[PDB]
Amino acid sequence: SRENVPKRLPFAARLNTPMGPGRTVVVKGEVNANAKSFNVDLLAGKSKDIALHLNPRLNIKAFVRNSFLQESWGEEERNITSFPFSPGMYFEMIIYCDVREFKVAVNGVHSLEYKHRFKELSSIDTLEINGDIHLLEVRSW
C-alpha cells in the first residue's frame, strides 16, 4: 500500500518513507484480556539496529524503552507519569519523529519523549510489532 508493505502477528513491515522529522507512525489495537507484554520496534532494516524499542508491560504496568545499537541494548528508560494501557481495551499509540527525539502518545495523551540514539533517521525504515495484542491498523505518514 501507500504507506508500508508487510514483509498478522508477529507483524513486520517496510515503511514506504523512512523516518525523519514530521513522520508519524500510528499503531491501533486491542490489548488482550490476559495480556502480559507487547512490543513495537522501529528498525534500520540493513544493520538490524533497533532505533526505538517500545515495550508496554501489562503485568507490571511499566512502559519500557531502549535501543539496540552496535549489537547491544543500551540503558533502559522507564519513567512515566501514568500507565496508559489496560487489558482488553482498544488503544492508539502515536510515534512522532521530531528533530531531537521521538514523542510517543497513547490515546491522545503525550506519554514520553525518547532522545534519538540512532542518529541516521532516514535509515529507520522497518516496523515490527508483536506480543499480546490484537493489531487492528497501522498508519505511517
Curated annotation (Swiss-Prot):
Compartments it resides in: Cytoplasmic vesicle; Cytoplasm, Cytosol
Distribution of this protein across tissues and organs: Ubiquitous. Selective expression by prostate carcinomas versus normal prostate and benign prostatic hypertrophy.
Residues that, per the record, bind a beta-D-galactoside: W73, G74, E75, E76, E77, R78, N79
Superkingdom of the source species: Eukaryota
Residue intervals of the Galectin domain: 11-141
Its biological purpose: Beta-galactoside-binding lectin that acts as a sensor of membrane damage caused by infection and restricts the proliferation of infecting pathogens by targeting them for autophagy. Detects membrane rupture by binding beta-galactoside ligands located on the lumenal side of the endosome membrane; these ligands becoming exposed to the cytoplasm following rupture. Restricts infection by initiating autophagy via interaction with CALCOCO2/NDP52. Required to restrict infection of bacterial invasion such as S.typhimurium. Also required to restrict infection of Picornaviridae viruses.
Domain topic, free-text comment: Contains two homologous but distinct carbohydrate-binding domains.
Subunit structure: Homodimer. Interacts with CALCOCO2/NDP52. Interacts with PDPN; the interaction is glycosylation-dependent; may participate in connection of the lymphatic endothelium to the surrounding extracellular matrix.
Name of the protein described by the UniProt record: Galectin-8
Full-protein positions shown: 171 to 317 of 317
